[PDB]
Structure 1
């Protein structure tokens, strides 16, 4: 570590701590930036050499965090919690946590290399028949193929190709991650992740939330299973059993909007899937981003800077380069460079993703002048909710009409049901999955789930919550959790469950602030500068203040609350409930053991 990056001398009182924090900040931007840059160079161009460079950058980051971490502990570890500047408390709090910097040198290297190798495995995995990539090839098949056998080949091929080789590395990563964070005072890595929400009752609170949301999920599930039964027959669909995991339009069955055309209750109404219109109008990735950008500026939030357009990767490279296609938003910590890396496809659901990612960027733009340690969301769920809130307005038939993607719908009860169903397939279907992923990972981190039970416990949770079953037999050679991006890429997941609840709280508060007075689900906050000012306040706060306070200022409540979500969906909730009772549906999957047979002569 260069002497210019070393911590100097500071007094052991609150005054000296302010100077310490300032000095940290003065050096941290350079170190964080070199690391984000190397990560970028790798993720947009996966090679052995770029991985080597990224790891080298990661090592320097760890060295810097060690030097300043230890100095913070030495000087302030007792007294810092009693400092009366809450922002300073948060900075010191952040700096004293070394994470992987706690590992001895050889283990830091092992850890850094594991991250590289798991990332490589997931993002370069292919299914050969030459060979299909996840994005766009297998994504497209799962989205639009209605051949049972073809869907199965894609689902099984993907889970096999991505999951199996990840398992040994993931075991090694879990052990090292735990060793690292134990030194920071946490029982395991999961405990560290959960600490970001600063709630002694976090897990209970999520459980209570889910209890309220579950009946909506059960009704949607029963309704969709009925349609699937009509399409695929009694051989492949059990009306009292879990749904085969490959039939819901999505590799992870995490969102079901791609099977909308199968379940659209009133087809004679205008087609709410505007994809073919985007295609006919010649929309490209770049136009999707401009359209998203303009919504932000309509709220008097920030446009994307030139560095964003010049630096971002908005399409899958045509040069055959290997990239991490999974959409992400990047803060380079230099207050100038902000980027999105997305293998953008021209679809309606991709348009929503563009908004999601740009929500992240907008947060970055708004809090770029805070000290580095405070450049985070009020909690990670806040960061995930921003773009989704705007996307709720964009999805409304009225907004789609405003932007030339839809002919004015008859504002009647049946148009409402269509729309709320399409939204339910996207938002309600996700809830059990958003909830279960970190439950699996928390179990792994605590040792409750050893490698010998990785798949057993994954499918337990997948069945328990989503009511799905694998369409082919799985065993512990398979590592099906590994075939979902966030696991090998070590990105926490509970943020999304939190987000999916919170975004409806945001939507309600912003719509009220916008002076809108109709039904919640028909709200469009486009061009509300009052709604923009309210959202801006949240964004500029970063992690400077307790999330409960920031939420109170915004929404009038200091807690996550399912009621705004329920109010938004109430009409389709009622309707689905009636369709299910009239069809004599069983709510749930009491034949919990059931799996479908193989298609004739597979493969």
Structure 2
């Protein structure tokens, strides 16, 4: 009985490595070379992997997991009973795979064109406009144009995508696809836990929002910013207003303590995409963690091709399921923002290497948030002014209270601003999946949440036919989002714990764990667990306790909360957006 189940897991593990490696190869070849031929091969490998999933999943379902004594085998077999899309009938499975490919291709090849002028891709062209233009109409052109071309083009697919992903979820024992996705956390209290964490971050976010709103009023004019209303969504330096640090120049707390232009410093010093990834690899090995293998450097795509290939630019990390071949695909630009992205992606690679010897079913993060958090933890140390000065990308900024508050503001514009964005994406999709948002009101309900959680309004009133969620990568690519909310909370818990393990004293935001072997050992022991244990065990190995908590993030930013409250009170700011119905008049 126990013996047949053990044998089954061994056979599943052997055969899964082969077929998933072939799938990953076809998927990579399409993502790095969008053509009719690579698309056709990819759809064929989709059917091959479904045949495997159906064979082994059907077997797994013949086991009564209740009667298995070994808890590791029990856990693997329970997981393999979920066929995901391979539960669908063949005709629906083919339709679903084609819909997914059509949606992700539509996003990745969309362009926005000037009349009898040039056509801009999202990366680098439109993202550069959003980051650097300080002209309301130019930002509006890029913001609206991207939604018109990418978002509107996904709408034709999304209702059928929803029907099919939900159908597969029901065939695997869930009530809808959002139930299935939430199950990855194995935490019955997930929704309440996330809401409580969101509420703890409100003082910081509301104060940041009011301060930034005032600064935008100063630059863009009183006729275009309502000091008691939501902020227009195209003014925050980022296409989705999900991180705001590119408008640091407009909001700097102490302009008499300026920072060196880090993009120009990186360019003058000869930085390249490969150098950026080499620096990330060096930070990981300084903690005693694993270097990426030589193969990574030969096979990764670390910059946009110049040879005519169309590619999926959106950065991502790839496991080829053979314990040897790991790769990053990123259209890297030489700037500080993308150095942080490089660390994020190298954190995924680290996790892949740490859990490579577990059974494939257990080769995941402790929960999806943990997978997202590893690289960001190291990037918190890289981002310190002390570390950036050691890279010759900032001047010496220490010993200055003004530089200290400036740094905390730079960090808040990304980390605090992202909290409400990362909360709302799957609040929307969970309600699409459970049927309480229909295609009649996709876009209206999206904007209701953008208002409620982020305090943003669209600069141009939306019209029927708009599908602004489709203009965000994870929606057409069907990548869950609450992982990023979880990550941004727990990365500060991990930073706090690793800094204490490294012997740091003083304010958390001054900590840099470079070269700490004690810090590396904490992370390594947790990552080696993969998905073999409930995630509170990995939380315990890193932090010494088992809960998710916003306390670390709040501690990191405490000096900035104090500064923001004093500043906002001086100016008479009304926190929030009680005039929540305000929208731009022109």
Q: TM-score range by the shorter chain?
A: over 0.9
Residue 204 (structure 1) aligned with residue 179 (structure 2): no
Task: Tell me the equivalent position of 1:87.
Answer: 72
Query: CA offset at residue 536 of structure 1?
Result: 0.5
Task: Tell me the equivalent position of 1:5.
Answer: none
Query: CA offset at residue 365 of structure 1?
Result: 0.8
Query: CA offset at residue 144 of structure 1?
Result: 0.2
How far apart in 2 are the matches of 1:326 and 1:38? 17
Which structure 2 residue ranges, 5 or more long, are not aligned? none
8 Å contact kept, 1:270–1:407: no
How far apart in 1 are the matches of 2:548 and 2:257? 36
2:156 aligned counterpart, secondary structure: helix
Which residue of the other structure, out of 53, 60, 67, is the alignment partner of 2:55? 67
Which structure 1 residue ranges, 5 or more long, are not aligned? 1-12, 599-603
Task: Tell me the equivalent position of 1:8.
Answer: none
Query: CA offset at residue 204 of structure 1?
Result: 0.5
Query: CA offset at residue 272 of structure 1?
Result: 6.0
How far apart in 2 are the matches of 1:81 and 1:428? 44
Task: Tell me the equivalent position of 1:555.
Answer: 543
How far apart in 1 are the matches of 2:278 and 2:130? 28
Alignment of 1:360-379 (within 5 A): 360-379=348-367
> Could you tell which deviates more after superposition, 45-54 or 430-439?
45-54
Residue 119 (structure 1) aligned with residue 104 (structure 2): yes
Task: Tell me the equivalent position of 1:396.
Answer: 384
Query: CA offset at residue 84 of structure 1?
Result: 3.8
1:62 aligned counterpart, secondary structure: helix
Task: Tell me the equivalent position of 1:314.
Answer: 302
How far apart in 2 are the matches of 1:349 and 1:60? 39
8 Å contact kept, 1:367–1:540: yes
Query: CA offset at residue 479 of structure 1?
Result: 0.2
Which residue of the other structure, out of 87, 90, 99, is the alignment partner of 1:102? 87
Normalised by the length of structure 1, the TM-score is 0.95
Query: CA offset at residue 83 of structure 1?
Result: 3.2
8 Å contact kept, 1:223–1:580: yes
How far apart in 1 are the matches of 2:398 and 2:182? 46
Normalised by the length of structure 2, the TM-score is 0.98
Query: CA offset at residue 406 of structure 1?
Result: 2.1
Task: Tell me the equivalent position of 1:3.
Answer: none
Alignment RMSD (CA, Å): 1.0
Residue 165 (structure 1) aligned with residue 153 (structure 2): yes
Task: Tell me the equivalent position of 1:151.
Answer: 139
Aligned length: 583
How far apart in 1 are the matches of 2:129 and 2:434? 37
Query: CA offset at residue 466 of structure 1?
Result: 0.6
Task: Tell me the equivalent position of 1:405.
Answer: 393
1:406 aligned counterpart, secondary structure: coil
Task: Tell me the equivalent position of 1:281.
Answer: 269
Deviation string 1:509-561 (CA, Å, 9 cap, x unpaired) is 10011111121100000000111111111111111111011111221221110
Query: CA offset at residue 270 of structure 1?
Result: 4.4
Deviation string 1:145-173 (CA, Å, 9 cap, x unpaired) is 00100000000000110011101211111
Query: CA offset at residue 412 of structure 1?
Result: 2.7
How far apart in 1 are the matches of 2:104 and 2:530? 28
Query: CA offset at residue 416 of structure 1?
Result: 1.3
Deviation string 1:178-229 (CA, Å, 9 cap, x unpaired) is 1111011100000000001111110001001111001111100000000000
8 Å contact kept, 1:272–1:419: no
Deviation string 1:469-501 (CA, Å, 9 cap, x unpaired) is 111010231000010000000000000000000
How far apart in 1 are the matches of 2:409 and 2:12? 50
Task: Tell me the equivalent position of 1:521.
Answer: 509
Query: CA offset at residue 82 of structure 1?
Result: 5.0
Task: Tell me the equivalent position of 1:440.
Answer: 428
Alignment of 1:494-573 (within 5 A): 494-573=482-561
Task: Tell me the equivalent position of 1:350.
Answer: 338
